[PDB]
Amino acid sequence: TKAEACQTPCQCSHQLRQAAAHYNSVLREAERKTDGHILQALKLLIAATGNNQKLQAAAVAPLATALKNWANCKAETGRLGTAARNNIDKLNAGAEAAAILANLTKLGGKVELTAKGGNGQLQQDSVTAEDLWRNTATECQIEEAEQGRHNFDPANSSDKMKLPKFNPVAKIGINCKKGGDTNNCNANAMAQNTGKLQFDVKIEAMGTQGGNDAASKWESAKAAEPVYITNELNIIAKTLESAGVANQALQNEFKQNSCAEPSEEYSDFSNSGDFSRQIIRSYSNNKDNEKETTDKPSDLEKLIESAYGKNGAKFKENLWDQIDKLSPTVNKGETNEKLNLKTEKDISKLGEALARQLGYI
Amino acid sequence: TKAEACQTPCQCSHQLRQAAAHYNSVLREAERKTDGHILQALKLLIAATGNNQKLQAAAVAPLATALKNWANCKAETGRLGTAARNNIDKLNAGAEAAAILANLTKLGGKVELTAKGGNGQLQQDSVTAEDLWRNTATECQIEEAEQGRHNFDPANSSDKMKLPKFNPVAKIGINCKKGGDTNNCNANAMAQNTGKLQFDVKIEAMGTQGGNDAASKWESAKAAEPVYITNELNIIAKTLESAGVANQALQNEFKQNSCAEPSEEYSDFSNSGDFSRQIIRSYSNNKDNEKETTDKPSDLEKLIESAYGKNGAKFKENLWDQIDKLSPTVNKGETNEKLNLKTEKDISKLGEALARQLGYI
Ligand SMILES: *[C@@H]1O[C@H](CO)[C@@H](O[C@@H]2O[C@H](CO)[C@@H](O[C@@H]3O[C@H](CO)[C@@H](O)[C@H](O[C@H]4O[C@H](CO)[C@@H](O)[C@H](O)[C@@H]4O[C@H]4O[C@H](CO)[C@@H](O)[C@H](O)[C@@H]4O[C@H]4O[C@H](CO)[C@@H](O)[C@H](O)[C@@H]4O)[C@@H]3O)[C@H](O)[C@H]2NC(C)=O)[C@H](O)[C@H]1NC(C)=O
Ligand SMILES: *[C@@H]1O[C@H](CO)[C@@H](O[C@@H]2O[C@H](CO)[C@@H](O[C@@H]3O[C@H](CO[C@H]4O[C@H](CO)[C@@H](O)[C@H](O)[C@@H]4O)[C@@H](O)[C@H](O[C@H]4O[C@H](CO)[C@@H](O)[C@H](O)[C@@H]4O[C@H]4O[C@H](CO)[C@@H](O)[C@H](O)[C@@H]4O)[C@@H]3O)[C@H](O)[C@H]2NC(C)=O)[C@H](O)[C@H]1NC(C)=O
Ligand SMILES: *[C@@H]1O[C@H](CO)[C@@H](O[C@@H]2O[C@H](CO)[C@@H](O[C@@H]3O[C@H](CO[C@H]4O[C@H](CO)[C@@H](O)[C@H](O)[C@@H]4O)[C@@H](O)[C@H](O[C@H]4O[C@H](CO)[C@@H](O)[C@H](O)[C@@H]4O)[C@@H]3O)[C@H](O)[C@H]2NC(C)=O)[C@H](O)[C@H]1NC(C)=O
Ligand SMILES: *[C@@H]1O[C@H](CO)[C@@H](O[C@@H]2O[C@H](CO)[C@@H](O[C@@H]3O[C@H](CO[C@H]4O[C@H](CO)[C@@H](O)[C@H](O)[C@@H]4O)[C@@H](O)[C@H](O[C@H]4O[C@H](CO)[C@@H](O)[C@H](O)[C@@H]4O)[C@@H]3O)[C@H](O)[C@H]2NC(C)=O)[C@H](O)[C@H]1NC(C)=O
C-alpha cells in the first residue's frame, strides 16, 4: 500500500522490524524451494536407477535439471543466509533502540516546589508535584498510520527508506514564579504559599546542545517563562546508524535471487538448457553431445516426442505417473516397508531406498 | 570459562550477546556438517553408478551411511533453525536494551541555581551548573570482569544463567542550601550569592516507586540533604524479561544435537547399523537382509574383509583412493571438463557429472 520514509522513533522501529521480517521470509522461501528440488531429485534418482529401462532413460534429463536447480538454490540460500547472519542482528537492535527512544520522548510530568513558612523557604509540604516520568508500559501508537511511514519497502523505491539523523537530547526546563502575578523571581523571592519553582525534563529525538537561556528570561522582572537547558545524550543514535547501514547491505543482497520454484510441469523443464542438452545426450546418436539444442529444431522435438510425447504432452504419464508406481523398500526392524513415492516426503527414507536399490543389483 | 549470573545492565548485555553468538555458531556448524555429508554422498553416488564393478559395490554401504547422516543433519539444522528464527531476535533486542539501560544508569550531573540580587531571587546569572546528563558515547565497562558475570554458559550449569529482576526508576534529587552554614532552607531563603538549589535525576536499574521524603528532611532547620522522589519508568524491563524466556527456550533446543561430523575413516562407518546392514545386503547371499549383524560375527567380518580389507584396513585404498581416480565429465561450453573428485567441492558440478553418467549407459 503506502510505504514512506519513517520520521518518528515509533515509525522507524516498526519499519526496521518489518525489514528484518521481510528478509527472514525471503530466506525461509529459498530454503523451502531448495528442499523441494532435492526431494524431486531423490525421486528421480530412484527412477534413474530402477529396472524399468524406459523410465530409467526418461528420468535422467529431468534429474539433471532438478540437481542444477537444487545446487543453485543451495548457493543462493548460502548467499542470503550469509547476509542475514551478518546484518539482521543490527536491525533487531535498531528496532529496539528506536522503540526505547519513543518511550523516552513520551515521558512527561514535573517536579514543583511551593514556598512554605516564608518567602523563598522550603519545608515539609513544599513538594506540590512529583510525577516526573511516572510511566505505564504501553505500545507506541504509530503516528499518521494512514500515511504508512511505518511500512517498509524492500525495493527502496524513490530511495525513500532512509533513517533520520537522530541525536537525542535532554531538554531541561526551570520555571520560577514569584506568585500573585505572573512574574518570574528576578525581583522577588517565591511568595509564601503561592511562589512556585517547576523542574521538568523532556527527551527529544533530535536536538543541539545549548547552555541555559536565562539571559533572555530572567534578566528582568517579567512574565514567567521556563529557562531551558539542552544537553546531548549521545545514546541510541549510533545503534540506529549501524542499523541503517545493515538494512542497506541486506536490501542489496535480498533484492534479487535466482532460486527456481520446484515444478513437475513440462514447460518448466523445457526452459532449461541442462534438460535439452541431456535429452540429446540420452536419446540421440551422439552420446557426447554438448549442445543445448539441435541444428534442426525438429530433431530435438523428435527425441522429446519419443520420450515424453509430442511437445511433452505425455510428460506426466511417462515420468511422474510411472514414478508413483514404484515401490522401493526401506528397513523396518526385522522386515521392510514399501515407500509410496507419490506422498513420501522424508528424505531419510528416500535416501535409504535409493541406497538399497543400488545394492540390490 | 568462568561464567556467573549477570548482575548489572552491562554484564547482562554482554551475556545475551554471547548467547546469540553461541547459538548462531552452533547453527553454522550444523550447516557445515550437512554440506560435508551431501558432498560425500554425491561422490559416492558417482562411484555407485560407475562402470568399475568392484567400486560400484564398495560404494553402496558407505553411501547408505552418508545419506542417513546427511538427512539427520538436515533434520537437526531444521530443528535448530526453527528455534533460532523464533527467539534470537529477542536476544538481540535484550542485549541492546540492557546496553541502553547501562547508558542511562551512568548519566550524572545536575542543575544548580544560585540566589542573585537578593534572598531567594533568580536572575540571569543564577544557573551556576547545568551539566545534567551531558554524555559522550563510550562502551560500557564490564564491572568485576574477573567474576565472569558477563560470560554465557550454554549448559546453564547450576541454573546460573538467570536475568536479574529489572524495574528501572528515575530517582530525582532536590537539595536546598540556605548558604553561610550547611543548613537547608526550612527557616531561611537562599541567601544572595551563597544559597543554592540543586536538582538532579539518576536512573537506577532496580527500584520501587516512592513519594517525596521532605517530611524527614525539610521538617526543621538542619544540615541540608537532598529530598528524593523515585518514579517507576516501566521501560526496558519487559524486553529483558522476554529475552530471558527466549534464552531459556533456545538453551533447551541447542544444548544437544545429533549431527555427525563427516568423515572418511572406517571406524566412523562401522558405528552405523545402516552400514553393516547394507554390507550384508550387498555382499552376502541374502539380498533381502534386514539385520544389522550376522548371527556369527565372523560372517560379517568376512564380508568386510572382501570389500575393505580385514577390519576395514583397506577402506581408503578400496574406496576413496578409487574415487579419486574417476574422471566424470561436466559440460564446458562446446566441449567437456573432467572433474577431479579428490578436490572438487561444487555440488552443481558433481550433480551434473552424476546425471551425465546415468544418461551415458
Ligand atoms: C550504551 O549502549 C550502547 C548501545 O546502544 C553500547 O554500545 C555497544 O557496546 C557494545 C559493547 O558494550 C558493543 O558490542 C561490542 O562491539 C565490539 C566491536 O564490534 C566487539 O568486539 C564486541 O564483541 C565482544 O563481546 C561480545 C559479547 O558482548 C562477544 O560475543 C564477542 O565475541 C566479543 O567478545 C570479546 O570481547 C569482550 C569484551 O568486549 C570479552 O568480554 C570477551 O571475552 C571477548 O574477549 C576476547 O576478544 C577481545 C577482542 O579481540 C579481546 O580483547 C579479549 O582479550 C578476548 O580475547 C561487542 O560486540 C556494541 O557494538 C555497541 N553498539 C554500538 C552501536 O556502538 C555501549 O556500550 C553502552 N555504553 C555505556 C557506557 O553504557
Ligand atoms: C517502548 O519500547 C518497547 C520495547 O522496549 C516497545 O514495546 C514493543 O512494542 C512493539 C510494537 O511497538 C512490539 O512489537 C509488536 O508486537 C506485537 C505482539 O507480538 C508479540 O507476540 C507475537 C506473537 O503473537 C510475537 O511474535 C512477538 O515477538 C511479540 O512477543 C506484534 O503483533 C507486532 O507485529 C508487527 O511487527 C512488525 C511491525 O513492527 C511486522 O513485521 C509484523 O507483521 C507486525 O505488523 C502488524 O501489526 C502492525 C501494527 O502493530 C501493522 O502496522 C502491520 O501492518 C501488521 O498488521 C509487533 O511485533 C514489541 O513486542 C514490544 N516489545 C515488548 C518487550 O513489549 C513499546 O512499543 C514502546 N512503547 C512506547 C513508545 O509507548
Ligand atoms: C535506499 O537508498 C538510499 C540512497 O542510497 C540509502 O540511503 C543511504 O543510507 C545509508 C545507511 O543508512 C547512509 O549511510 C550513512 O551516512 C551517514 C551520513 O554520511 C554523511 O555525513 C558524514 C558525516 O556526518 C560524512 O562523513 C559522509 O561522507 C556523508 O557525507 C554516515 O554518518 C553513516 O556512517 C556512520 O555510521 C556508520 C554506522 O556505524 C559507521 O560505520 C560510519 O563509520 C559512520 O560513523 C552512514 O554512512 C547514506 O548516507 C544514505 N544515503 C543518502 C543519500 O542519504 C538507504 O539506506 C537505502 N535503503 C535501503 C533499505 O537500502
Ligand atoms: C537456567 O535455568 C534457570 C532455572 O530453570 C532458568 O531460570 C528461569 O528463567 C525463566 C526465563 O527468564 C524465568 O521465567 C520468567 O520468570 C519471571 C519471574 O518469575 C518468577 O517470579 C514470579 C513473581 O512474579 C513468580 O511467580 C515465579 O514463580 C518466578 O519465581 C516471569 O515474570 C516471566 O514471565 C513473564 O514474562 C514473560 C516474557 O514476556 C511472559 O511471557 C510471561 O507471560 C510473563 O509476563 C518468566 O516466566 C524463570 O522464573 C526462571 N526460573 C527460576 C526458578 O528462576 C534460566 O532461564 C535458565 N537459563 C537458560 C539460558 O536456559
Cα–Cα distance between B263 and B313 in angstroms, integer?
16
Longest dimension (CA), chain B: 114
Helices (H) and strands (E) in chain B, counts: 9, 7
CB contact under 8 A, B218 and A122: yes
Cα–Cα distance between B331 and B349 in angstroms, integer?
9
A22 CA to centre of ligand 2 in angstroms: 15
* CA B288 from centre of chain: 46
Helix, strand, coil shares, percent, chain B, to 5: 50, 10, 40
- Dump the DSSP string for B112-151: EEE--SSTT---TT-EEEE-TT-----PPPPTTGGGTTT-
Name, in order, each residue with C-beta under 8 angstroms of B282's C-beta and a sequence gap of 6 or more: A359, B57, B60, B61
Residue B73: closest CA among B38, B97, B47: B38
Looking at the CA of B101, name the nearest ligand.
Answer: 1
Cα–Cα distance between B61 and B141 in angstroms, integer?
57
Q: How far is A157 from chain B (nearest CA, A)?
A: 27
Q: What is the CA radius of gyration of chain A?
A: 36
Query: What region, left, alpha or beta, does residue A73 occupy, with left being phi > 0 and alpha being psi -120 to 50 degrees?
Result: alpha
The answer to whether the Cα torsion of A346, A351, A357, A360 is positive or negative is negative
Q: Give the nearest partner residue to B331 out of A199, A277, A287, using CB atoms.
A: A277
Contact B224, B183 (CB under 8 A): yes
DSSP one-letter code for B210? B
CB contact under 8 A, B92 and A97: no
| Identity at A183, one-letter amino acid code | N
Name, in order, each residue with C-beta under 8 angstroms of A328's C-beta and a sequence gap of 6 or more: A46, A338, A339, A341, A353, A354, A356, A357
Three cell numbers at B112? Answer: 544548580
User: Cβ–Cβ contacts within 10 Å for residue A20, how many?
Assistant: 26
Pocket lining: B94 vs ligand 4, CB cutoff 6 Å: no
DSSP one-letter code for A93? H
A253 CA to centre of ligand 3 in angstroms: 17
B202 in helix, strand or coil? strand
CB contact under 8 A, B199 and A111: yes
Name, in order, each residue with C-beta under 8 angstroms of B186's C-beta and a sequence gap of 6 or more: A117, A121, A122, A123, B218, B219, B220, B221, B222
Beta bridge partners of B210: B230
CB contact under 8 A, B97 and A100: yes
Task: Write the CA distances from B89 to A91, A93, A130, B257, integer angstroms.
Answer: 9, 8, 37, 22
CA angle, residues B11, A13, B101, in degrees to nearest 5: 25
Experimental method: X-ray
Locate breaks in chain A with C to N over 2.5 A; list the residue preceding each.
none
Across A220-245, b (16+ Cβ under 10 Å) vs e yields ebeebebbbbbbbbbbbbebbebbbe
Q: Give the nearest partner residue to B290 out of A120, A121, A335, using CB atoms.
A: A335
| Identity at A361, one-letter amino acid code | I
**Long-range residue pairs from A136-139, CB within 8 A, at least 24 positions apart, any chain:** A136/B234, A137/B234, A137/B235, A137/B237, A137/B238
A253 CA to centre of ligand 1 in angstroms: 26
* CA B216 from centre of chain: 50
| Residue in this structure with the C-alpha cell 522401493, named with its chain if needed | A328
The answer to whether the Cα torsion of A301, A304, A310, A316 is positive or negative is negative
Cα–Cα distance between B291 and B295 in angstroms, integer?
9
**Interaxial angle between packed helices A273-283 and A297-308, expressed in degrees from 0 to 180 and rounded to the nearest 10:** 80
Q: Give the nearest partner residue to A60 out of B89, B170, B359, using CB atoms.
A: B359
**Long-range residue pairs from A331-334, CB within 8 A, at least 24 positions apart, any chain:** A331/A356, A331/B274, A331/B277, A331/B290, A332/B290, A333/B290, A334/B290, A334/B291
Instruction: Name the closest residue on chain B to residue A291, using Cα atoms.
Output: B334
Cα–Cα distance between A124 and B215 in angstroms, integer?
5
Cα–Cα distance between B202 and B198 in angstroms, integer?
13
**Interaxial angle between packed helices B273-283 and B53-105, expressed in degrees from 0 to 180 and rounded to the nearest 10:** 170
Cα–Cα distance between A268 and A275 in angstroms, integer?
10
Name, in order, each residue with C-beta under 8 angstroms of B53's C-beta and a sequence gap of 6 or more: none
DSSP one-letter code for B317? I
Contact B171, B35 (CB under 8 A): no
User: Cβ–Cβ contacts within 10 Å for residue A340, how many?
Assistant: 12
Pocket lining: B97 vs ligand 1, CB cutoff 6 Å: no
| Identity at A225, one-letter amino acid code | E
B196 sits in which H/E element: strand B196-204
Q: How far is A159 from chain B (nearest CA, A)?
A: 27
Q: How far is A173 from chain B (nearest CA, A)?
A: 10
Looking at the CA of B92, name the nearest ligand.
Answer: 1
Looking at the CA of B94, name the nearest ligand.
Answer: 2
- Residue of B18, B157, B248, B251 to test ligand 4 pocket, by largest number of atoms within 8 Å of CB: B248
DSSP one-letter code for B200? E
Q: How far is A229 from chain B (nearest CA, A)?
A: 7
Considering only CB atoms, which chain A residues are within 8 Å of B287? 360
CA angle, residues B14, B16, B17, in degrees to nearest 5: 65
| Identity at A133, one-letter amino acid code | W
Question: Which of B124, B139, B292 is most worth mutating to test chain A (most A CB atoms within 10 A of its CB)?
Answer: B124
Q: Which atom of ligand 4 is nearest to the CA of B163?
A: 12
Ligand 1, atom 8: closest residue by C-alpha: B139
Q: Give the nearest partner residue to A199 out of B199, B227, B351, using CB atoms.
A: B199
* CA B188 from centre of chain: 60
Residue A167: closest CA among A232, A212, A103, A91: A232
Task: Write the CA distances from A337 to A324, A330, B331, integer angstroms.
Answer: 16, 5, 39
Beta bridge partners of A170: A203, A231
Q: What is the phi/psi pair of residue A25, to 5°? A: -70, -40
Pocket lining: B242 vs ligand 4, CB cutoff 6 Å: yes
Cα–Cα distance between B81 and B254 in angstroms, integer?
10
CB contact under 8 A, B67 and A184: no
Three cell numbers at A12? Answer: 522507524
Task: Write the CA distances from B63 to A45, A359, B70, B262, integer angstroms.
Answer: 14, 10, 10, 12
Q: Where are the beta strands (DSSP E) in B243-328?
A: none
Instruction: Name the closest residue on chain B to residue A211, using Cα atoms.
Output: B130
Task: Write the CA distances from A90 to A97, A245, A350, B322, integer angstroms.
Answer: 10, 9, 40, 49
Query: What region, left, alpha or beta, does residue B49 occupy, with left being phi > 0 and alpha being psi -120 to 50 degrees?
Result: alpha
Residue B244: closest CA among B3, B1, B12: B12
Three cell numbers at A118? Answer: 516564608
Residue B175: closest CA among B163, B184, B186: B184
Cα–Cα distance between B53 and B75 in angstroms, integer?
33
Query: What region, left, alpha or beta, does residue B194 occupy, with left being phi > 0 and alpha being psi -120 to 50 degrees?
Result: alpha
Exposed, middle or buried by CB within 10 Å (0-12, 13-18, 19+), for A54? exposed
Q: Give the nearest partner residue to A133 out of B134, B170, B282, using CB atoms.
A: B170
Q: Where are the beta strands (DSSP E) in chain A?
A: 111-114, 127-130, 169-177, 196-204, 227-232, 329-332, 335-338
B13 CA to centre of ligand 1 in angstroms: 9
A259 CA to centre of ligand 2 in angstroms: 31
| Residue in this structure with the C-alpha cell 534429474, named with its chain if needed | A63
Looking at the CA of A238, name the nearest ligand.
Answer: 1
CB contact under 8 A, A234 and B190: no
Three cell numbers at B259? Answer: 549431527
CA angle, residues B188, B193, B197, in degrees to nearest 5: 60
B282 sits in which H/E element: helix B273-283
Residue B261: closest CA among B252, B253, B271: B271
Three cell numbers at A234? Answer: 549521545
- Residue of A206, A245, A250, A251 to test ligand 3 pocket, by largest number of atoms within 8 Å of CB: A245
Contact A278, A59 (CB under 8 A): no
Residue B319: closest CA among B35, B56, B17, B3: B56
Cα–Cα distance between A240 and A96 in angstroms, integer?
10
B337 sits in which H/E element: strand B335-338
B175 in helix, strand or coil? strand
Beta bridge partners of B5: none
Q: How far is B120 from chain A (nearest CA, A)?
A: 5
Pairs of residues, one from chain A and one from chain B, whose beta carbons lie less than 8 Å apart: 304
Pocket lining: B14 vs ligand 1, CB cutoff 6 Å: yes
| Residue in this structure with the C-alpha cell 541555581, named with its chain if needed | B113
